[PDB]
């Protein structure tokens, strides 16, 4: 572990992007996370909220 | 049947169309939670009960 | 605007709201503004038979 600093820079950035991609799966309270179902199984007035 | 002994029937393995229901019964209330009926004619389901 | 409709469909007269009265019969925009008025009239438009 002589090169700890450079390796650490790379991992911090990679981990940040990784968590950003994983956070797409969270629902935040909506009935489903993927946009396609929401636009598929619901009328526009309720789909807005 | 009466409320305290409601009856359940499984309907599956068939082509369901929810456009014929408007016929029977003046339908004082016909509302859905989680889907909207005009779009209900499209999706495929797991197991629908009545 | 004036016309005559059923007594279980009042909810259906809304911008892009589903039932069977606001998709293909006559439809208002999704950005509608105004008011709607309906009154069940069975004493002047319904005859015997």
Curated annotation (Swiss-Prot), chain A:
What is the protein name for this chain?
Spike protein S2'
What is the originating organism of this protein? Answer: Severe acute respiratory syndrome coronavirus 2 (2019-nCoV)
Q: Which residues form a coiled coil?
A: 7-49
State which stretch of the full-length protein is shown.
Answer: 943 to 991 of 1273
Give the protein's function: Subunit of the fusion protein that is processed upon entry into the host cell. Mediates fusion of the virion and cellular membranes by functioning as a class I viral fusion protein. Contains a viral fusion peptide that is unmasked after S2 cleavage. This cleavage can occur at the cell membrane by host TMPRSS2 or during endocytosis by host CSTL. In either case, this triggers an extensive and irreversible conformational change that leads to fusion of the viral envelope with the cellular cytoplasmic membrane, releasing viral genomic RNA into the host cell cytoplasm.
From what superkingdom does this record's organism come? Viruses
Its gene? Answer: S
Curated annotation (Swiss-Prot), chain C:
Domain of life, source organism:
Viruses
Q: Which stretches of sequence are listed as region Integrin-binding motif?
A: 6-8
What is its biological role? Attaches the virion to the cell membrane by interacting with host receptor, initiating the infection. The major receptor is host ACE2. When S2/S2' has been cleaved, binding to the receptor triggers direct fusion at the cell membrane. When S2/S2' has not been cleaved, binding to the receptor results in internalization of the virus by endocytosis using host TFRC and GRM2 and leading to fusion of the virion membrane with the host endosomal membrane. Alternatively, may use NRP1/NRP2 and integrin as entry receptors.
Quaternary assembly: Binds to host ACE2. RBD also interacts with the N-linked glycan on 'Asn-90' of ACE2. Cleavage of S generates a polybasic C-terminal sequence on S1 that binds to host Neuropilin-1 (NRP1) and Neuropilin-2 (NRP2) receptors. Interacts with host integrin alpha-5/beta-1 (ITGA5:ITGB1) and with ACE2 in complex with integrin alpha-5/beta-1 (ITGA5:ITGB1). May interact via cytoplasmic c-terminus with M protein. May interact (via N-terminus) with host bilirubin and biliverdin, thereby preventing antibody binding to the SARS-CoV-2 spike NTD via an allosteric mechanism.
Protein name, UniProt field: Spike protein S1
What is the name of the gene encoding this protein?
S
